[PDB]
Design a protein around this ligand. Structure first.
Ligand code: HEC
Ligand SMILES: Nc1ccc(O)cc1
Length: 108
């Protein structure tokens, strides 16, 4: 909502020690505890190339956009009840703002 542009060398440090544990930022790493995120921008929820999703994440079909990605990041359990992502949710919007720029740079 109060988005502010970041830089690749900042968002990566966070994602690499917060999201890396289960996910993959590029398309060379096999699907770990979480699906591949490389190319989600512009697609609906539940579209990983070779990985299954929950009954609630599919029915949800959220169009992963710049602001929308934060909507779910703040609380995955509240938006998608029953989802496998048990990461906790990064409540601080200023902190996600920079994270979006990094992923955004990797997808486009
Ligand atoms: C492992 C415990 C996880 C951590 C840490 C993070 N995520 Fe996650 N995420 C995980 C799973 C297993 C799933 C699928 C949920 C299901 O029930 O099927 C997800 C999904 C997402 C998605 C949506 C993918 C899609 O719908 O195609 C996004 C955009 C996403 N996760 C982002 C994300 C970020 C940026 C994280 C760090 C803050 C993060 N996840 C950590 C498991 C895990
Ligand atoms: N629609 C959209 C949103 C965010 C991105 O990083 C790319 C494309």
């Amino acid at each position: 909502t109060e988005f502010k542009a970041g830089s690749a060398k900042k968002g990566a440090t966070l994602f690499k020690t917060r999201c890396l544990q289960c996910h993959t930022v590029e398309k060379g790493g096999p699907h770990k505890v979480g699906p591949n995120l490389h190319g989600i921008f512009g697609r609906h929820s539940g579209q990983a190339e070779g990985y299954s999703y929950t009954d609630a994440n599919i029915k949800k079909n959220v169009l992963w956009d710049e602001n929308n990605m934060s909507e779910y990041l703040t609380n995955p359990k509240k938006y998608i009840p029953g989802t496998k992502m048990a990461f906790g949710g990064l409540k601080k919007e200023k902190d996600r703002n920079d994270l979006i720029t990094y992923l955004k740079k990797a997808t486009e």
